[PDB]
């Protein structure tokens, strides 16, 4: 159950090496979609433009709590589909007549002007105005500004072409254009930003041609910088540990047999005589040197994750303990060990050289709180002119391999005790001389034994080239703001004494076979996952008015569902694995609060939020374009509205003043007939709830499709669809009078009518022309390739 996540990490890293092309920056050509439009003419110089249903998506709120919920549902469901058609596309393509000597370039973009002759029954004196309308549809050019302060303020050229159609189409197309052209920039500004972020002169970015400078690209909403990485500090230790464990697959130690032979050669003792320093390294093995190497690297990177040693001893000592403590003292730098770890080994060393002190007394008299002071005193005593023991140390490094990264780096200690030159480093003197022997309990060590041990603990000069490449790639690929992170999982910093002694005796160092770019790609993936979660929270969950800190624990199920849904998509497996593996140490609530704070601090919402807010207003103003009506009036004596008689031969529009309004259709349906007829007798009755209506516009010749508005099967029950019938007045049949025979015979004694209607009347034929916006490809073309670094010229 411990290696169940190692396979996950390995698979994630391996699939991360499968390169995938990204169209995030690339756009494509697009065209505006033509909406269904029916227009007719009842008489000369009168043109009616009927509102045809364009979108049929709505959900009636059965709870009847409010009306804004229905409009929001319509707007959101419509914008879901509208945004999916212009995902990575910009409106660039339109139909035109190319400019020539016959005149300037003109547009033929809406419905053809020729069809209006048949559709409107124009006379010969109105057809003459059509060619001069066509010749007046010239294209106007202008400029628009793009980019924010964080990016570069660019300038794109735009066109404003005329098309013939409704104003509703104009508003929809304007909303689409304003939504689509968010987060655009040019290639030269992007190259300037890339040059600014990468301050290293070694990497050269490809130069842009003259034609590639005005090309337009799409950038991210908010940039990923060091501020994002800073806020990840509480859980940064786990990320550092698992990156080290995944990307360090080897260890460069020397086999123990050669170390034993070297120590035997250096020891000036007879082979028959038994020596305990010799007999103690024969019971050691380099097993788990890799785990100790990973923990060494973590202790070097993080100054808070200092190693804590687990000593098997409690009160007494042993030759193994003494020799291992000496090896740790002479081979492991103190900047990678905790204060207690330093103090224990220092006291073990001092108990033998002290004239009267003993290990039990030092432990009992000392306090764990003041270990650093006591350690300093003991080190000063052992660095005097009577006793001299060299204490291993290490230094900081700044070197780095060049690579493209969005974050700054720092400097770390080395996990080994040597300098750039290759000579061992000691806090004090490099010489060993002692006044007397080592005696603690019955265990004794000769003075030359320590000299031999110092002689054998010299690291091989040859591995120096391999010893520093790993340090270089570790320095150059880990953000600096993570170096102050705390420790959350204790077992990651715990190693026992025998393992550390075996690691230090053989001169092991971490080794790797991966490149710098894979590590930075993994870090970029982690940052991308955090940015995705923050954006989702900012666009869905960021609300301060209610349900914040005071919310009961029962509400956490709803809030967490979105986060764990986001974490289950592709490309988020690293963070998901790390989060689910260590839930005990870092719970879900603190993770949620950290993400909430990350989102509140300026993380931008997805543009669709404003798009839906702007579209919901459009939904309110024109109801019948989305196939819904606010209320219906049921009455036995209808009074027609004379104004619409001008356009329709007969219509369901009335103007009776309602009495006894009824909240919803269900209340009327559950009523009995006797009470229903009493309501009808007293006057017109109104049903308030919203309905899903459809309108049929018919010619006088066509027979009228029957609609079963009210079904009197057992009770007067209203239908849930309420189809209505209009018959149009044309120039063909304008002076005739049509009887209401067909309309009322197929209608019950109770009539279902409509209180309000909306349509556009145009007095001039040249008012049908509107305008739309397009990118000028000729002067601001779409970029087709990403910006890349120069390599492999051929």
């Amino acid at each position: 159950l411990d290696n169940v996540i190692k396979q996950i990490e390995a698979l994630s890293v391996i699939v991360n090496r499968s390169e995938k092309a990204d169209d995030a920056q690339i756009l494509g050509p697009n065209t505006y979609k033509q909406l269904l439009e029916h227009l007719f003419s009842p008489e000369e110089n009168v043109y009616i433009l009927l509102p045809i249903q364009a979108y049929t998506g709505g959900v009636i709120d059965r709870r009847d709590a409010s009306f804004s919920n229905f409009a929001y549902s319509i707007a959101s469901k419509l914008m879901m589909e509208l945004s999916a058609a212009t995902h990575n596309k910009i409106f660039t393509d339109y139909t035109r007549i190319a400019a020539s000597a016959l005149g300037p370039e003109i547009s033929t973009e809406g419905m053809p002007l020729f069809s209006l002759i048949e559709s409107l029954e124009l006379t010969e004196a109105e057809t003459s105005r059509l060619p001069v309308i066509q010749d007046s549809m010239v294209i106007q050019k202008s400029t628009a500004t793009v980019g924010n302060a964080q990016q570069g303020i660019s300038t794109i050229n735009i066109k404003r072409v005329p098309f013939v159609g409704s104003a509703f189409q104009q508003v929809i197309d304007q909303l689409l254009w304003e939504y689509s052209t968010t987060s655009l920039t040019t290639k030269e500004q992007r190259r300037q930003r890339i040059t600014e972020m990468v301050n290293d002169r070694r990497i050269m970015i490809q130069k842009l041609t003259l034609a590639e400078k005005p090309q337009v690209m799409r950038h991210v909403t908010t940039e990923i910088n060091n501020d994002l990485f800073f806020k990840m500090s509480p859980v940064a230790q786990l990320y550092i540990y698992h990156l080290d464990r995944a990307f360090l697959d080897g260890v460069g130690f020397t086999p123990l047999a050669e170390k034993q032979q070297q120590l035997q050669l250096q020891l000036k003792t007879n082979i028959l005589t038994a020596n305990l320093i010799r007999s103690a390294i024969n019971g050691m093995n380099t097993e788990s040197n890799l785990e100790v190497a990973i923990k060494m690297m973590q202790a070097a990177q993080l100054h808070r994750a200092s190693i804590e040693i687990a000593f098997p001893m409690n009160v007494s000592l042993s030759p193994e303990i003494i020799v291992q403590c000496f090896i740790v003292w002479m081979s492991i730098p103190e900047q990678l060990l905790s204060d207690r770890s330093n103090f224990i080994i220092a006291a073990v060393i001092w108990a033998g050289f002290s004239a009267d002190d003993s290990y039990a007394d030092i432990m009992r008299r000392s306090a764990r709180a003041s270990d650093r002071q006591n350690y300093d005193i003991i080190k000063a005593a052992l660095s005097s002119r009577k006793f001299k023991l060299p204490r291993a140390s290490t230094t900081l490094f700044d070197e780095n391999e060049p690579v493209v990264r969005r974050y700054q780096i720092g400097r770390v200690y080395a996990p080994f005790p040597v300098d750039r030159y290759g000579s061992p480093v000691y806090s004090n003197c490099t010489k060993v001389e002692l006044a007397s022997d080592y005696n603690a309990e019955g265990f004794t060590i000769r003075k030359d034994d320590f000299r031999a041990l110092q002689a054998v603990l010299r690291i091989d000069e040859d591995r120096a080239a391999d010893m520093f490449t790993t340090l270089r790639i570790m320095i150059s690929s880990i953000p600096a703001v993570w170096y102050d992170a705390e420790v959350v999982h204790y077992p990651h910093t715990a190693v026992e004494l025998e393992q550390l002694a075996a690691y230090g005796l053989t001169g092991a160092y971490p080794r790797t076979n991966h490149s710098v770019d894979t590590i930075v790609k993994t870090v970029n993936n982690i940052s991308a996952t955090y940015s995705t979660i923050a954006q989702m929270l900012s666009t869905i969950d960021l609300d301060p008015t209610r349900y914040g800190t005071s919310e009961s624990i029962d509400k956490f199920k709803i809030a967490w569902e979105n986060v764990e849904s986001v974490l289950n998509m592709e490309g988020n497996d690293f963070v998901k694995t790390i989060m689910y593996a260590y839930e005990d140490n870092f719970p879900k609530k603190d993770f949620y609060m950290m993400l909430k704070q990350i989102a509140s601090d300026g993380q931008g919402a997805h543009p669709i939020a404003a798009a839906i807010d702007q579209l919901r207003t459009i939904v309110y103003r024109e109801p019948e374009r989305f196939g819904y009506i606010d209320s219906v009036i049921l009455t036995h004596n209808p009074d027609v509205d004379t104004a619409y008689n001008r356009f329709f031969h007969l219509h369901p529009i009335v103007t009776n003043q309602p009495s006894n309004t009824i909240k919803n259709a269900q209340l009327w349906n559950e009523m009995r007939l006797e009470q229903q007829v009493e309501h009808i007798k007293a006057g017109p009755v109104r049903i308030i709830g919203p309905f899903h209506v459809t309108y049929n516009y018919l010619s006088e010749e066509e027979d009228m499709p029957a609609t079963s508005h009210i079904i009197m099967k057992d009770n007067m029950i209203l239908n849930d669809h309420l189809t209505f019938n209009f018959v149009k007045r044309e120039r063909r049949n304008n002076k005739k009078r049509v009887s209401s025979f067909r309309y009322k015979a197929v209608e019950m004694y109770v009539a279902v009518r409509i209180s309000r209607f909306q349509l556009e009347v145009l007095r001039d034929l040249h008012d049908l022309v509107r305008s739309r916006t397009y990118l000028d490809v000729s002067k601001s073309p779409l970029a087709t390739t990403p910006i890349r670094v120069v390599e492999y010229v051929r």
Binding site: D543, P544, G548, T549, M593, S600, D601
Partner: protein, 274 residues
């Protein structure tokens, strides 16, 4: 007090008032569900009284709201005309209207004509002057510098413009109507409402000290009436009534909320329902 109000005070005030209302609503929400156990209400509020979703605030503890209020007050009213980029200001024109004033005008502020002709003494809601020398009917006697709206009661030996008992202009002027010799006295009482919000006066006194212990060079402890008179006197001339109302609302709400976060009592209506 010394203080300079910049041209973008309404924008800062529209954020400060919203923050104050949010904090007060959270205070009542936490006050409704207090367990009444071993922990005091102060610990309960310090544990769960913070706001987590507002851009600009960097802590989930009440101290974050306090620090944000300090920043906004310093930016809006103090010498440093620093524009706070940390809070998100998108439109400096959009400003939600603040609630109307509710402070009764007890000590009305008036100035004499400068002829040294009348003596001025005050009362609960009326001023009354005595003529030092002879005065003829139809000349100025007093005029108010602090705008006032309301009704007029008990007008004797003087004239004010009024329609149905209601004052016409927001700065009425008192002019004598009869030739009145021999050191006579005229009175003028107003049942009107001055500038500010009467409710929550206890919290203002404790919060003005809190925010004067920080800006001691610019702000000193004082009464609410004098504070508002000086704050209104320091307003720029190029300022509409729609904007000055927001500026004054924030100017009074900041000390009240600062003192309310110390004494965890309720909040006034004009702070909650902003």
């Amino acid at each position: 007090m010394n203080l300079e109000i910049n041209n973008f005070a309404p924008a800062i005030s529209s954020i400060g008032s919203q923050l104050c209302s949010l904090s007060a609503q959270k205070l009542l929400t936490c006050r409704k569900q207090y367990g009444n156990g071993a922990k005091s209400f102060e610990e309960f509020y310090a544990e769960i009284g913070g706001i987590i979703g507002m851009m600009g605030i960097n802590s989930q503890t009440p101290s974050g709201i306090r620090e944000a209020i300090y920043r906004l007050y310093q930016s809006a009213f103090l010498f440093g005309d620093i524009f706070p980029e940390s809070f998100g200001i998108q439109n400096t024109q959009n400003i939600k209207p603040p609630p109307g004033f509710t402070a009764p005008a007890k000590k009305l502020e008036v100035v004499l004509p400068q002829g040294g002709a009348f003596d001025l003494i005050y009362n609960n809601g009326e001023i009354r002057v005595t003529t030092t020398r002879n005065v003829q009917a139809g000349d100025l006697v007093c005029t108010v510098t602090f705008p006032i709206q309301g009704s007029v009661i008990a007008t004797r030996n003087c004239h004010v413009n009024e329609i149905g008992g209601q004052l016409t202009t927001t700065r009425p002027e008192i002019i004598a109507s009869v030739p009145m010799p021999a050191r006579t006295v005229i009175v003028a009482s107003f049942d009107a409402i001055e500038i500010g919000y009467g409710e929550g006066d206890d919290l203002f006194a404790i919060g003005i000290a809190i925010l004067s212990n920080r800006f001691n060079g610019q702000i000193t402890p004082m009464s609410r009436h004098n504070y508002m008179t000086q704050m209104f006197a320091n307003l720029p001339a190029n300022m509409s009534e729609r904007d000055s109302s927001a500026v004054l609302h924030f100017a009074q709400a900041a000390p009240v909320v600062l003192g309310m976060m110390e004494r965890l009592t309720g909040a006034p209506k004009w702070v909650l329902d902003y």
